[PDB]
């Protein structure tokens with residue numbers, strides 16, 4: 001029933017796309033961040049002054065404790081929760097109960113932030129990232145097993161410049177347009193893909209392709225901006241600045257906004273990805289509309305930021321496409337998305353193929 005998995009995500013103007021879930025018996029309703037960058041299902045298990053609601057295990061007759069807690073740390077934020085299992089329903093999609101592992105948070109720091117509307121997280125990446133270990137089966141793996149659905153999910157995020165769709169168990173034709181292009185997953189932990197080349201206003205950066213996979217290049221719906229390793233971030237900033245000619249130093253680091261559209265003053269940025277046939281590639285392109293972001297005449301943020309360790313294709317880039325996480329065939333797909341528009345104007349482009357003769361056979365160090 002793919003057509004009832006349409007418009008099941010709310011985007012609350014850029015603070016994460018979240019899905020509504022009924023958890024336990026009788027059902028408690030949560031709002032859950034959809035995150036392709038982690039692998040735990042974790043929800044608030046006690047009151048917190050920044051959330052409206054939490055999951056109370058004592059009010060569920062089908063909840064079973066698993067007899068250990070788990071501590072998770074991120075670069076920013078951390079939490080400890082009890083591990084247990086309970087029944088889950090997704091009203092917009094899966095109105096049949098499946099039993100999943102769940103972490104109920106009773107201690108945290110800089111995790112529930114003021115104004116945020118989600119009170120848990122749905123981690124959709126591979127078991128290898130699961131905490132405390134890969135043997136804690138992930139939500140999607142439980143769904144695949146119990147529902148006999150294919151091992152594929154996909155995502156349309158429609159909030160460029162208000163929500164979108166998570167399709168569990170497949171692909172929805174009305175959500176994309178034209179051809180799907182697939183790039184292999186290189187490692188099944190994150191959705192790690194192989195980036196071959198960055199191009200600014202039609203000119204490629206002068207950097208070894210291994211810089212782009214410096215550690216890892218990943219597709220992560222739980223990250224806001226396009227994130228780039230420092231070296232790559234600094235080269236991109238120079239290439240953008242020179243190709244537009246308008247800037248205070250603080251615009252590039254996110255410490256100032258620029259107030260004025262400006263979009264015609266900035267260049268396209270293209271990411272080249274290896275195609276499932278290794279001898280070609282395809283590119284995804286974002287227009288200034290996605291990375292020069294109106295915040296409220298208007299005032300604008302640079303939608304790219306530095307990372308210590310990863311190139312992260314985050315939610316702002318994903319708003320430019322229909323994205324297919326084809327676990328079964330070990331690939332990620334990208335297609336043009338009808339809803340990737342600001343007042344009818346396109347925000348993004350996708351094209352291919354291109355030869356990969358000018359580039360190393362393996363760009364992943």
Ligand SMILES: CN1C(=O)C[C@@](C)(c2cccc(NC(=O)c3ccc(OCC(F)(F)F)cn3)c2)N=C1N
Nearest residue numbers: 014015016035037038074220221222223224315316
């Ligand atoms: C990066 N990352 C982490 O650092 C750990 C973890 C669990 C995490 C933890 C806490 C919050 C978040 N993410 C978010 O709050 C968030 C907020 C807005 C987001 O999208 C904004 C927009 F949709 F692009 F506009 C995406 N994620 C992610 N997931 C991640 N993917």
